[PDB]
A = this chain, B = another copy of it.
Amino acid sequence: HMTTSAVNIYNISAGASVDLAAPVTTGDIVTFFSSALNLPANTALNLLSENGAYLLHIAFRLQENVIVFNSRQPNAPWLVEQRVSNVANQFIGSGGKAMVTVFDHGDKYQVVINEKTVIQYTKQISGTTSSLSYNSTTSIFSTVVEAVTYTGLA
């Protein structure tokens, strides 16, 4: 009858993916920790489902000066973008490191950069997150990002 939660720790290199040992579902959390901020080509952090849908794609675009949030079915076009302007402003007082937290709230992903909520993203695709990935060409983050998941919360 007691709640047993879990912590899993992943080291994700730029241009790499990890399968989750414990999937992320409603009530759960993933935080991506970067040991650098540069602050560089477009850089993305992704939550994917088992079938390869992008449940949440977070694209940091320094030159265009926007963070793009979107979803995509496998082998299908991108869905409707949500944008937040001014990338640097989302990392105020960040120093030489950063964290990006995604709360799975069932109907929404709440994305928090350090302590600042940057979007309450209305989901365009539902389901459990079974993998994470980190894409860059010149990343805004450290070459290895540490992802920590907190699961079995609900």
Contact = CB atoms under 8 A, between A and B. Distances in A.
Copies in the complex: 2
A63 interface: no
Interface stretch (A45-53, A81-89, A105-113, A126-134): A105-113
A101 B110 CA distance: 21
Interface residues of A, number: 27
Interface stretch (A3-11, A12-20, A66-74): A3-11
A96 B120 CA distance: 36
A5 B148 contact: no
A117 to B, nearest CB: 7
Interface string A90-118: 00000000010101011110101011010
